[PDB]
């Protein structure tokens, strides 16, 4: 491993507005992106809210349906956008990327970003 995940320490969005949680990296030769995960904190663990694999994007909860968009045009930009922020969206979010190397083995890396919601 690996390409470096660039993220902010915190992000602040507006209640019922939209926010974009930055997770971007420069693609590297020898690291093929095979999985992207966004997770949220729940108690003493994290829970997957979004998965992107070979069959596309999967929001793992109806509450997020239509609310979650992960960037998919500029390579290495897998930033999370949340539509119409709820106060309950205040949380620690995690961006998690899996790269596959020429070995066929896989390198997982992740980053935690705090989301604050105002108004």
């Amino acid at each position, epitope marked *: 491993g690996h390409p470096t995940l660039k*993220t902010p320490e915190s992000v602040t969005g507006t209640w019922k507005g939209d926010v974009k949680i930055q997770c971007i990296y420069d693609p590297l030769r020898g690291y093929r992106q095979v999985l992207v995960k966004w997770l949220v904190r729940h108690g*003493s663990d*994290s829970v997957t809210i979004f998965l992107r694999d070979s069959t596309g994007d999967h929001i793992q909860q109806a509450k997020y349906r239509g609310r979650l968009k992960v960037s998919h045009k500029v390579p290495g930009d897998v930033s999370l956008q949340i539509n119409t922020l709820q106060m309950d969206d205040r949380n*620690h979010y995690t961006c*998690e990327v899996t790269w596959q190397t020429p070995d066929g083995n896989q390198v*997982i*890396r*992740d*980053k935690i970003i705090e989301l604050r919601v105002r108004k």
Partner: nanobody
Amino acid sequence: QVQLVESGGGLVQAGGSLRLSCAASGRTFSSYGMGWFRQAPGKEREFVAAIRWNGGSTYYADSVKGRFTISRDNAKNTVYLQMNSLKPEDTAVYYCAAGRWDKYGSSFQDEYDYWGQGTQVTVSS
């Protein structure tokens, strides 16, 4: 942001035990995985142990598996390294580190943004 201060290093007999502490300033502690690294004379810095933000999920280097534990006081924003059955080859400067990894990469130096001064631990034969 995080400023890290180690403490508790010193002299210790072989077979002995020693607990290192590391105070982390800042108010975003819960975003950071914490880790201990060490660097011996004439050798490159290596991973010792790490602990997730939750304060219970831990990771160890094979060289200290079974001997060392890592713990974390999330309220005091502190982490500790309990060492046991110390050998001369554990002699090194030990570093407290913090990074915003969640579950993964805790064994790699490049995943930590913030580093303490390091504290000296010497294990006499």
